[PDB]
Amino acid sequence: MIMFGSQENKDPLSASSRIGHLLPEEQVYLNQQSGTIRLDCFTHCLIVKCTADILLLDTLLGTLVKELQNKYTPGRREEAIAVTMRFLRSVARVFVILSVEMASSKKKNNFIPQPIGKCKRVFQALLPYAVEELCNVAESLIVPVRMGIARPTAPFTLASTSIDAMQGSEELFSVEPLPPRSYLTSASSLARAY
């Protein structure tokens, strides 16, 4: 599951040979990229769409932690870290989107939405690796505003209720990849994400 996106199932990642290959440099750009749309769909469903049963998330973290401290099997430690790192990148992507959508606690309710609360549980149980991965995620968001990279976009309102936030998130995450054959708003919004 986690190492999906790599290898070929149904997408232009598959059939990258002569049929989708005009001299070798076509594959070079098609390679060096690993799919994560399928991975993101699994993560978003497990964090957002599912209920507060909080048993599948514990079950997933139980086996990841168990293999992260396995020594008697040769080479198991290295593949456990690579699996963990890719999974934590997916959770950070969902957490950034969810937190950016929702507004600040202006009503002094002192309540954090359940989907975000599940994201924090993953980060805490994997503290050394989550801290490392959140460092790179933050760097990707603020690098365009360090220079004039722009992509101005347009201002948008901030959702106050949970239901509105779950609306926007699923539009961009429940998506099928592909088959085979105003500037100041963007800077301020990226700075808010950082």
- Contact positions vs another protein (CB under 8 A): 5, 11-13, 15-16, 19-20, 22, 26, 29-30, 32-37, 89, 92-93, 96-97, 100-101, 104-106, 136-137, 139-141, 143-144, 146-157, 168, 171-172, 177-181, 183-184, 186, 188-190, 192-193
* Of 20 and 113, CB closest to another protein: 20
186 within 8 A of 147, measured Cβ to Cβ: no
Least separation in angstroms between residue 130's CB and another protein is 15
* Of 97 and 130, CB closest to another protein: 97
Please tell me the distance from the alpha carbon of residue 103 to that of residue 111, in angstroms, as a whole number: 12
Least separation in angstroms between residue 107's CB and another protein is 11
Least separation in angstroms between residue 154's CB and another protein is 4
Least separation in angstroms between residue 187's CB and another protein is 8
* Of 37 and 61, CB closest to another protein: 37
Nearest to 39 by CA among 113, 94, 82, 98: 94
* Of 15 and 57, CB closest to another protein: 15
Provide the token pair at 64: 């990841």
Phi, psi of 4 (to 5 degrees): -70, 180
Least separation in angstroms between residue 27's CB and another protein is 8
* Of 56 and 143, CB closest to another protein: 143
* Of 71 and 181, CB closest to another protein: 181
Least separation in angstroms between residue 72's CB and another protein is 26
